[PDB]
Amino acid sequence: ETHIHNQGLAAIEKCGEAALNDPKMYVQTVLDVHKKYNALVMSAFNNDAGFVAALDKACGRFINNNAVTKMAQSSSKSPELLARYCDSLLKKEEAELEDTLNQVMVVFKYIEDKDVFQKFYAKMLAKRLVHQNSASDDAEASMISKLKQACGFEYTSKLQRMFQDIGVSKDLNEQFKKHLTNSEPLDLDFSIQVLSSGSWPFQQSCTFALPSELERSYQRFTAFYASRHSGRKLTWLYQLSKGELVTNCFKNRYTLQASTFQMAILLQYNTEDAYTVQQLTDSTQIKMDILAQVLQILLK
Amino acid sequence: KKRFEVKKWNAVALWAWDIV
């Protein structure tokens, strides 16, 4: 146990500093040490109970406190990275991914800060499921099932409930499409994701005023919703809205992904071309930090 | 030239009970 603990620590030190911002090879170092000494225990030591126990204790010792954990001065840097690794696996065949997630599980069984990892993974799963960038949902369901078997019952039910929420929203969209199929379709297509507030970790943002270009449509849909279901109200989050743009002016056709903020800024250019920060700030009351981040994203 | 049109609008909303 002492030798294998020092060996895992030595491997992590040999990595040292490039593992703060790259979770893949940190988790892979941990897994390489674990697999080497697990094979050694199974073959040479006849799969004895005490020797596997020593393996488990040393592995759990060097996972939770190592070079990057000390450097960040937070043991929660160990599950966080693991969570990020999961995200890296589930962005946008099946057997390889399933084996990789089982390896993620054999790492995760040694995590003592399970709530930190679970909160990180819940927020990342929410960010994934909201708009786009999700792999085959078979993998996500299998991940939720593995968390079911490993952890308790309530948190995985929370995750399954937000999955059921996205499914219910998809079913409502299908119902709306069916309703429009046997009627007169509108001039434009509207898509919404109706999500439970309790299950999703989102927070209310700054107040925003709807422009006059969509007020009539919004009022009409609100009246229709009240007629169909007067007992439910929609808390609109304009910060998380999306948008696709096609530039039909060049020889080649491009696709641009941008939010409503981008289109509002572009629509503001119909009158002037050069904009002063002070004028827009006084007119719209926008904090310096958020617009600075927006400009940095624009430049990057 | 420099003309933009709206075709799709993907929004997000949360539902909660109106009793309280």
Q: Which two tokens stand for residue A57?
A: 């204790």
Residues in chain A that come right before a backbone break, where C and next N are over 2.5 Å apart = 92
- Selection from B11, B20, B13 nearest residue A196 by Cα: B13
Count of A-B CB contacts under 8 Å: 77
Which of B8, B16, B18 is opposite residue A191, by nearest beta carbon? B8
Interface of B with A (CB under 8 A): 1, 4, 6-18
Q: Which two tokens stand for residue A208?
A: 């925003």
Q: Which two tokens stand for residue A63?
A: 């996972």
Distance from CA of B20 to the nearest CA of A (A): 11
| Cβ contact A244–B8 (<8 Å) | yes
Backbone φ and ψ for A264, nearest 5 degrees, come out as -65, -45
Q: Give this entry's resolution in angstroms.
A: 4.6
Backbone φ and ψ for A242, nearest 5 degrees, come out as -120, -175
Interior/surface letters A275-288, b for 16+ CB within 10 angstroms, e for the rest: eeeeeeeeeeeeee
Which of A193, A196, A231 is opposite residue B12, by nearest beta carbon? A193
Distance from CA of A287 to the nearest CA of B (A): 23
| Secondary structure of chain A as H, E, C letters | CHHHHHHHHHHHHHHCCCCCCCHHHHHHHHHHHHHHHHHHHHHHCCCCHHHHHHHHHHHHHHHHCCHHHHHHCCCCHHHHHHHHHHHHHCCCCHHHHHHHHHHHHHHHCCCCCHHHHHHHHHHHHHHHHHCCCCCCHHHHHHHHHHHHHHCCCHHHHHHHHHHHHHHHHHHHHHHHHHHHHCCCCCCCEEECCEEECCCCCCCCCCCCCCCCCCHHHHHHHHHHHHHHCCCEEEEECHHHCECEEECCCCCCCCEEECCHHHHHHHHHHHCCCCCCHHHHHHHHCCCHHHHHHHHHHHHC
Q: Which two tokens stand for residue A242?
A: 């999306």
Interior/surface letters A154-179, b for 16+ CB within 10 angstroms, e for the rest: ebbeebbebbebbeebeeeeeeeeee
What's the length of chain A? 300
Residues 6+ positions from A11 with CB-CB distance below 8 Å: A29, A32, A33
Angle (CA) A135 A139 A143, round 5°: 125
Determine the Cα–Cα distance for residues A46 and A40; give it in Å rounded to an integer. 9
